[PDB]
Structure formats: structure tokens, C-alpha cells
Design a protein around this nucleic acid. Sequence first.
RNA 1: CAACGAGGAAUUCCUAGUAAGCGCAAGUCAUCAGCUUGCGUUGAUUACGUCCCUGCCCUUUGUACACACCGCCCGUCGCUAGUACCGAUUGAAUGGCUUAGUGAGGCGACAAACUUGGUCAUUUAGAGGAACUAAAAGU
Lengths: 141, 43, 825
Amino acid sequence: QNYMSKGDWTNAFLLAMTLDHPMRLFNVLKRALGESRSRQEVIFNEELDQAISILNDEQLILLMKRCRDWNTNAKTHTIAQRTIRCILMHHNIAKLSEIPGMVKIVDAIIPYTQRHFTRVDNLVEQSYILDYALVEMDKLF
Amino acid sequence: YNVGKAEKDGEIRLKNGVAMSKEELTREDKNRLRRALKRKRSK
Amino acid sequence: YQRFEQAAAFGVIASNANCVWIPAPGQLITSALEDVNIWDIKTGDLVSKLSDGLPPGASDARGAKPAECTYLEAHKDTDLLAVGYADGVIKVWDLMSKTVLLNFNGHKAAITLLQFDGTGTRLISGSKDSNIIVWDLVGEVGLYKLRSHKDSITGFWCQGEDWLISTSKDGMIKLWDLKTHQCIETHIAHTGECWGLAVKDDLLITTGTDSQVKIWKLDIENDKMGGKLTEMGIFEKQSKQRGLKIEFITNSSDKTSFFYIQNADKTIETFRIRKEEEIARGLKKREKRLLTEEEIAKSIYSSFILHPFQTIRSLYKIKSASWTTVSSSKLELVLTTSSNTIEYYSIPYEKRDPTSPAPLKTHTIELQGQRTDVRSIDISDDNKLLATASNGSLKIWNIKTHKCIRTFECGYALTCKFLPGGLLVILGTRNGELQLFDLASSSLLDTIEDAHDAAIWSLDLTSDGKRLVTGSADKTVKFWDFKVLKLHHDTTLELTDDILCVRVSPDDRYLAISLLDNTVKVFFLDSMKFYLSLYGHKLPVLSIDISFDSKMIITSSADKNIKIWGLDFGDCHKSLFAHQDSIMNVKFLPQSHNFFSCSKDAVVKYWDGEKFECIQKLYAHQSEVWALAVATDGGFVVSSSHDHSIRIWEETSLKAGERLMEALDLGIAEIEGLEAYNRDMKLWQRKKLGEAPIKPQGNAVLIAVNKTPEQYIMDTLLRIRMSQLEDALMVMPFSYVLKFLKFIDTVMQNKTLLHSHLPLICKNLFFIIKFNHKELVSQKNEELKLQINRVKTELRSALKSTEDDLGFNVQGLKFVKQQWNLRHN
RNA sequence: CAACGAGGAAUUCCUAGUAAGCGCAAGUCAUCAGCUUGCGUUGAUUACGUCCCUGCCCUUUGUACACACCGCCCGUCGCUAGUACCGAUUGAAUGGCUUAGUGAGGCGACAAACUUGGUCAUUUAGAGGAACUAAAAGU
């Protein structure tokens, strides 16, 4: 509670992971991700994604279960994708495959990521009305 | 895949996909969520 | 109707609360039920009974029990009394004029502590619901509500403005930063409950369920998370029960400190804490035999720094205490016990010896009480009053002064009566004994041992008084005459069952007796004739009453209803259900068919015998009303109960679209106001610094909700719904569309709330320009052209940035699954 | 030297062969002739939108299978279970202390068992009071 109040998201993350407090885990990941977009290879701050890089098998299987059922929203899915990405780029892929239980999770969350890829790609597709409006505004003279 | 109920009785997973843990949530939200699933279990 | 009311209440000196002491030994403020009474220890006369200005029983008295006082607390210098009650309210009074200054309801359950802080103007209050609230007295406002405990606040300790520390009825002690009002450090003090808290600045002391008293070191200037308050060791007491109040003092004239732990039962353990010189010169002596083992011995401190003292006992169970000190030989401690009595003890101590094998009480205020519940009340013609107790404290109070002028010692006495000339009392006790007393002379005219074989239960005089009837649980009734002033047993009627009430008619006519076998029997006194048997009550049956015309009887029982019977044929009239616990007593008026019934659920009730309505529902007691007695003429009625009380009763709307439009206009007005301020700052920093703009003060609602204007517009844009969003965006005109584009252009510079609202910004912005496309491409301004280009670049950069990691995660996760498959499919 | 020249305040009904005008027949076991029901002829004005007002109703897990969209309605009082509290129940009893005698008998000291006041731990037959906490609907 003191860490979540005063800031300090890395030791807050590992205490929320040790206590298994999932709403607090979503809050510490969402707050750290938002301040990561604010400031400026690395996607969270470096201390927190090193803290993600050094957690063991049952901790990362409960972390990926949390990422699994956050990915079913279209709202809380970005936090899940950043956490999945830092796990993927900070852990060993042979280890992640041979952990017992890591196929009934990644098969659960491949099609949800594909659904979100289709939706965000269509958002980029219909983002070109700005470009069409700009070419009309330049034809105006 | 879809979000089912929680697999242990120390947490709940709502259909949304977000989850609370019994110990972690505040007692006001425990009253609120008890009332909510009571209605959801009443309809 | 000529209704009833309450004239005065008395019989209580110390009730279910604490006590505060005021200096001149000195006086004492303590609790009666729902009103506070002040007493001078020197003599003991009731110098004040500060009460509510409304009599309980009046027209505007509300239909529930009155709020029992549960915590006294006193501000000495500015002369205030903060008292708190059992519903949660706090009344603050000035003790000079005795009016109510402050009402501070606030809580939801009964309250457990008060404390004035910074001596005036601030009051902190802890309650049986786990909140603890700070109140200001110059603003009449609950300032802060510290809300993290779980059961019930058992104690706290504050210093001004920065640190509070509470401990509650779970196992937990908590330290509170009063600047942020977030709990800082939480420990488990004791494994069950935690009932005590006291602290002299270095050491803190707590106690829990059974004898394990824990010393803590609070280091306020610490910086670590766990370690603002550390635990330094436990020790034991002599009581295995709940120590539930600890309190410290610093006697002057050297400097020394003493603390007591009062217990549940009967006992206050006092302790002297020693000083640093004997800490230093006692360390070596347990550090003898010369170091890992010696370090373990030095770590295993409590018996070292604390020194037990004279363990003050009492006769009864102890409810509260507080002391004063001079000379370290006058530890003068006032003590309110449960069976209503205060006691002023004082232990001397010659600074090495406590000079006594057992301490001595110097005063005791106990005259205006009973020490037990009054099992029988009675009245004179109109002047005096009779209260019958279990210890023996028969007391003859008087109505016109509410003072016991005469008191005796009888035994476990449950029923009594006067004698018709006055100045003479008959009484029966719970063993086989009857007793007679008077008013002018001493106690015992005579006792009759073996008046009955078992517990007597009810007696009654005849209207001339020469002949009385005693019915007892030895399945017998007996008759007694007065021979000359002695009792003459002459006849005895043995029944099959334990008779537990008797009554005669008020005209010597009938003898109605209530058996344990669910019935009553009406006899003729002149024949023992067995006139009637009234039956059908369905539990054992308490008090009877016969009316003045000797035509109508009442019948109360533990079936929660009273039955009205017509005595001519023994036919029932009503069976009206009162009183949801048990009707203990029921009594007529003198001349009317109206009657009263007091019951075991803290209520008396006034009925009529013609319409059988409830005339009045009187609600002044707090617990089981054991007896009531009506005046012989005139009709004022006294009622006496289990809370040691005796009391008299006498006669008298926008929608989406326009919400977004007004939010957009004030938000963009603030935004371009600050941008004009920034352009002014750059021009007055790039030119001759002689002038600039004065100040744009920020918006009222923006600083009131504590939001940047982008966040304000963003949450009202969130709070419109998806069904009327395409209408909310279609209602607004093109000027609001242009300032909406300004809002989006500013919000995708703050990349925090851009990325948390990307699909909402995309949906709204693309619908807005898709709907307003014809006018937008006809606007001619390079400012808007650069605006659209900037929004386009930042928005598409955010969207490609999120789908980059989406595609990365797709290919990585299907690689993980595929390499697991080619490993062991 | 009485009434009256399209009827005040209020109020009711009404959306296409409808409102209204017009006549002609019948008189169908109830009803109707102080009239009722048919039948044709002539035939419009204005709404055909809206929940702003007045009300009435419905829902508040999306479930029903994809795609897409959404992304925890709220509060009070009750019910159930637990945890400690407040005393009254001569609580009563056990056991140990301790109140003072009766003390068979072993060996006139000594004295196991019986009466008889307070101290500590526990059960309440149980019944009250008024607190806090917990509570699980998902092929």
C-alpha cells in the first residue's frame, strides 16, 4: 500500500505478485506503462522490466494468466500486450515453451491478439480521412 | 477461449477479464461485488 | 388526555462508561444513564446532574431507547466536557452554563474514546465501528476520517498534526500520518484482540487478551517502512483476563513515571517505570557470568525496565480508573466499579517502599446506589419509597429529595411491601426467610427463619394490613397475622405446584395466586373456596392485578402478552400482545381501569381497560425493568430496573452534446488563455522587460475538480454513452468542431492520456471530420491545416506503435506454441 | 315596463372516406320510440414528429453462435454464519486454594472422609442486549 501510494512501481509490482493481488497488479502495470509513455529496447522503466526479467516459473505463469484474462477486453489489452512483450524479450523462449502450462495460455491468447490486430489495423486504415482532407485543403487554392 | 469463473476461491474473475483477489479488495468493494453478483444470481 | 411524563431519575452513580477527574481531593464527573452527574469526593453530595433539556416521556421524545452515555472526556483549562453516547453522537458542553454547545453525530455505532488535541479546538473520536474521526470545534466540522481498522477502536494516542496511533479490537495497531490520512505502518500486536494503549514518549505499551503485555519502541523520526514502531519484548501480569486500560504519569520533584493496567476483574496492576541510571547500573548485574548467550539473555528487557508495584484490589468488578499524584507518596487513584460505586484509593510510597501490605481507600461514594438490580420497588401513601436488593441494601428513599435516608441489610430479597400506617417494611428473601424493618429505629424488628421451605416469591398485605399472604416456591402459600408487631403463622395452603405470585383484591374479597403451571387460581379469602381457575396463558405466569371495583384482573407472563379477565365469571376479554421479551410487572391506577405494565425489554407501557389501546409507550430505561409501583392516591408511578435506575413518572438537466459543448468551450478557453499567457511570457522575455500580462487565474471548476482541461473534457467525453455519442457529435456546430480539433491537438502532446484513450479519440475524431468533411475542406486557414497534419502524425504514430507490439506478440506466441509442438507433439 | 343576434371560466373528444353537413329506411327475444340502429350522398383542415412537459410501461449479466460494439448501475434495512463484549441467572457444578468446626481411625500429639465464607479456570438449561466481520451465479 505504501509503495502504490508513493510511486515506486518495481517493488510494488513484486509485492503485488507475491501477495497475488491482481487488481493492484493491473494498476501498477497500467500506471507504470502510462508514465513510460510520458517519459521519452525498454518498454517499462528499466528497474521494473528487470524485475520482470528475474521472476521464476510459477510467477510468470500466474503473470501470463493475468495477461490472458486482461487480453479479453479491448480496453485493458494494451497492458497485457506490453507485459507479454517484455516477458518475450527478457526471458528464454525454450524455457517459456517448456514451462508446464504455457500452451493452454498462449493458445488462449493468440486469437485475441489477432482480433486486436485486425481492429487496430482498421483504425489505421480509416485514419487516412485526415490525409484525404489535407489533400482537399491543399487543392483549395 | 472465454473468461470463465475463477479457478480458486481466493479470487474472482469477472466476465470483463479483470480480476480481484478476496484479501486484496477493500470491504466497500466487497459489499459492492457481493451485492452485484447477488443481483446477477437473482436474475 | 392527561398523559404521563418523567419527573426525575436517580439510583445511579456510576454506570457503563468511564470517569474523568477534575482538580479542586477533587471532584469527579461520571456517567449516569444518558446524563452525566458531577460529584465532590470530599463529602459526596450530588453537586450537578447535567442532563438533556427535554424530559424523556414528553411529546417530542422519539420512539426508541435514549442514547446511553458511553464516554466522558474533559477539557480542563478552557472548561469543556466532550461526552459521547451509544448511538454515536458527541455533545460538547460548557461546564459553566451547562448547555450543549456542539452536536457531532458522525459515527454509526457507539463510541469508545474521545481526546482533545492541541489543547483546544480539536477533538478526535474513536468508535465501535472502526472509524476514527477528527473534529474541529471552531468550524463544527468533521475534518478527517481515518478509516482502515476492522473491528472497534480500543485506544489511540495523537500528537497534534502529524502522527496518530490507534489500536483496535482486531489484533492490530496502526500508525497514521495525519497529513495524508493514509495508514503508514500496521502490526499485529496480540493474536486475539488488542485492548490497551499507553505511551510515555519513548516506550509504548499495549495489552491484549490474557496477561501478555507488549512493550514497543516508537521511533518517530524513522524512515524505513516497517520500523517506525518496533516491538521490544513482552512480560506477564497476575490477571489472566483482559487488561483494558493503561495510563501513565510523570510525577515531578525528581522526575518519575507510573502506569496502571486495569483489568476485567476487580484488580488494577500498578507499575513504576524506573530511570536510566538504574537501567545503566542494572545492566551489568544480569550481564554477569563472563557473549552470544549473554546477548540472548540481555535481549530476553521488560522485567528490566519495568517494576511492578502495589496491586490495588477492590470488592467488585472494576469499570474505570484515573489518578493524580504528588510527592510519589500520594498516588491518589479514583475508581468507578460496575456495581455502582466510586472509590478514591491512594497508595503511598516512600520512593523505595510502598509502606503498606495493601492499599487504602480514602473515600467511597456508594450511598445513593444498590450494588445490585432492584428486584422490588414500593411506595408510601405518597412520601417515601422502598428499594429491595440482593446484597441486602433495602433502602428507603424519599420522593421529594431523591435521597436514601434509611438503609438496612437483608439478603437476597426479591419482594417487599410497606405496612399501612407507614414507617414499617415487610420483606421476603430468596431463601426460606422473611424479615421486618421500620423507619425510626434500627434494622430488625424480627426475622423469621424457616418462613418457607424454599424460595419465597410474592407477598401481599390486606388493605387493612393486619394479615399478609406469602407464596413461595416450596409449592405452598401461607397466611400471617400481626400480633402485638410480630408475625403469626396460622394457616398454610399447599398446592401441587410452585406458586410464584399472590395478590388480594383491594377490598379483602379475592385471593388470586399465579402458579408455575401456566394458570392462576382465584380463591375467596373468607373460605379458601376456589372460586375460579384462569387458564390458557401457555408459559409460567407473572404479576397479577385486581381492579379497584374488584371486577377486572390483569395477568402478565413470559408469553409476551397480558390477558384481561372478567372476574365475575372468569371470562377473558382481551389477550393483547405487548412487549416483545417478557412482562415482569403490571399494576392498575388507583381509581381508574387504566394500568401500566413494565417489561423485561426496557419499556413501560400505559394502557386503558375500556378500548384496550396503548395510551403511552414510555422509553427511558436501558435494560430489564424489574418492578414498578403506583401511588396509592393521585397516581404517579415509579419504575425501577436492571441498570440500577429508579425513575418517577407524573402527569403533564442537460444532455450529451450540450454537456460536451459547454465543457469544450470552457476547456478551450482555458487552453488558449494559457497559450496567450505563454506567448506573452516569450515576448516579455524576448523584448524590453518592462511589462507583461498580469495573471490568468485558472478556472473555478477546473481547480475545484483538480483537473487539467484536457482531462476535464476527456472524462465528460468518456461519460457520454455510446448510443448517443453519434448524436452528441452531430448536434454540435462547426465552431465547436474546430475547438474540438484544438482539444485533440493539445491532448496528443500529453502522451499519457492519449494512449489510454486511443480508440475513443479515434472514433470521435473520425466521426467528427467524416460528418463535417464538406465544411472542413472549405475552411482556409494554415493554422488548422498544420493542426490537422500534427494530429494526423501523432495519432497514426500512436496507432502504429500499438499494432507493432500486437504483431510482435502474435508471431512470438505462435512461435512459442509451434516450438512446443515440434518438441513434443 | 320578459327572453334572445352563435354562447364566459373551464372542460371533453378527435387523425382519411376520418371530423362535419345531408337526407332515407328499418324497429329483429336484451336496449330503444321523449328514441335506437342501419343506409347511402357530400367530404376536408392539421399531426403523422417527439419524449421537452404530463403520465404509464420496460430493462439494468448481452447470451442467442459468428462479425462488430460494450467493458463492475447504486444505496439502506433485513436473513445466515462466526468472533470477542455487557451483565442478571442465590448461574450450579468440578477441581485447587482457603472460612471454621465434626472428625472414624492409624501412630494423647496426628488425623483420610462430612458441614461451612471468599479466590482462580470452565461450562451456561439457556434466554437477553448491541457490536463487528464474513457471505459466490459461470456448458
